């Protein structure tokens, strides 16, 4: 199945979807009539092939001269998030689901673009320094201007946790120069190991009913959860608890036996981790209605994640903020103020109980589940929409 969760990052109206299309052919759709013209809310999904010519996009070597057929390397799946500074929660969720990143910078649009920088920062925070950098709108720029842009980018990427991350000049519309990108996908991104015995944990980003308009109820379908595994091969025929729960104010975890564990385009026996998977469960498709299973944790039955509202956070912050042009000073965190705490996939609205030296105690208005220590990206409301302040770990 899908071997490595590779994410796509860039500015809004630059062409992440376009890039995906160029790579795979699989469309992110762009939907709900708002997003048909403009920008997606959900993650965009695509399945790209790597079968190398060693003597590729398709498993045949008729194209690159030598008739010695395309030698199977990998199959990779995309994690394409919204690159808008309003919808950052989704991006954050994607980030602690990904194994590696793909940057997208346009030629004619500037080098210190705010959103892109923010994305980069997020990636750095959440252990995602494996970034393949792509020059995108180069089918517009001069023989000198492009070079200048590249130089500027290089200059920028000197103090960042990205040091010598590779840059490729592609056209997402004209279909050129993606060979290099493909090569890098095997070269610069090795897949981090993901075993059998590391306790099975599924991180849900999407809720899906496949209940088509027109059918009869004597021919029914269950609930499908679109979520990623980063530990534990889920096999067909297992019982599950989804632990952030269902709301009564108290919450109670949801129990579902596996109908299917579906990856690629064809349903499989297994779901080997480091991939984003559509899990058919006996759970109602009415709870998989639109975007209900977003930021929920799934464990195999006989397991104890903990649903915390009162949290011990170890926090770290910036000197100067991101999301804006206008990079504003980080004023100190203020008590009993609504922050957004992004933990793996959750985007919970939290109130500050205490501020110490490097630790903070937080109240959650919506309960999140901590199994391990859990990776956090933090966010705040200063300029209406949510800006990225810093990062944390749950000290548990």
């Amino acid at each position: 199945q899908a071997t490595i969760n590779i994410g796509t990052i860039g500015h809004v109206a630059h062409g992440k979807s376009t890039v995906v299309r160029a790579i795979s052919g699989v469309q992110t759709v762009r939907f709900k009539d708002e997003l048909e013209r403009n920008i997606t809310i959900k993650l965009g999904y695509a399945n790209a092939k790597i079968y190398k010519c060693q003597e590729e996009i398709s498993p045949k070597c008729q194209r690159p001269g030598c008739p010695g057929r395309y030698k199977l390397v990998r199959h990779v799946s995309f994690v394409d998030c919204p690159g808008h500074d309003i919808l950052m929660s989704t991006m954050l969720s994607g980030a602690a689901v990904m194994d590696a990143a793909l940057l997208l910078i346009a030629g004619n649009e500037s080098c210190p673009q705010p959103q892109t920088s923010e994305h980069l920062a997020a990636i750095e925070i959440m252990k995602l320094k494996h970034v393949i950098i792509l020059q995108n709108k180069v089918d517009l720029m001069r023989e000198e201007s492009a070079l200048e842009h590249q130089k500027s980018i290089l200059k920028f990427i000197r103090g960042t946790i990205a040091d010598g991350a590779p840059i490729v000049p592609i056209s997402a519309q004209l279909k050129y120069n993606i060979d290099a990108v493909n090569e890098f996908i095997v070269k610069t991104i090795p897949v981090p190991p993901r075993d059998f015995m590391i306790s099975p944990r599924l991180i849900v980003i999407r809720s899906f009913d496949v209940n088509k308009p027109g059918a009869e109820i004597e021919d029914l379908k269950g609930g499908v959860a679109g979520g990623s595994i980063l530990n534990g091969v889920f096999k067909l025929g297992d019982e599950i608890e989804i632990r952030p729960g269902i709301v009564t104010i108290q919450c109670k975890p949801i129990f579902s036996n596996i109908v299917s564990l579906f990856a690629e385009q064809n349903d499989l026996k297994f779901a080997v981790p480091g991939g984003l998977i559509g899990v058919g469960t006996k759970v109602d498709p009415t709870l998989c209605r639109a975007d209900r299973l977003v930021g929920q944790v799934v464990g195999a039955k006989g397991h104890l994640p903990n649903i915390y509202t009162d949290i011990e956070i170890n926090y770290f912050l910036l000197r100067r903020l991101l999301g804006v042009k206008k990079q504003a000073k980080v004023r100190k965190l203020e008590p009993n103020e609504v922050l957004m705490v992004n933990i793996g996939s959750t985007a919970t609205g939290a109130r500050v109980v205490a501020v110490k030296a490097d630790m903070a105690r937080l109240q959650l208005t919506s309960p999140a589940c901590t199994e391990i220590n859990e990776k956090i990206a933090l966010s705040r409301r200063i300029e209406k929409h949510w800006r990225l302040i810093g990062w944390a770990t749950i000290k548990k």
């Binding site: 180069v138 840059i167 592609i170 004209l174």
Partner: peptide, 17 residues
């Protein structure tokens, strides 16, 4: 490195419509 990139860029420039 931005010089195994330079070659790529050159190639791209060569094969534009």
């Amino acid at each position: 490195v931005g010089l195994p990139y330079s070659e790529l860029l050159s190639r791209f420039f060569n094969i534009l419509r």
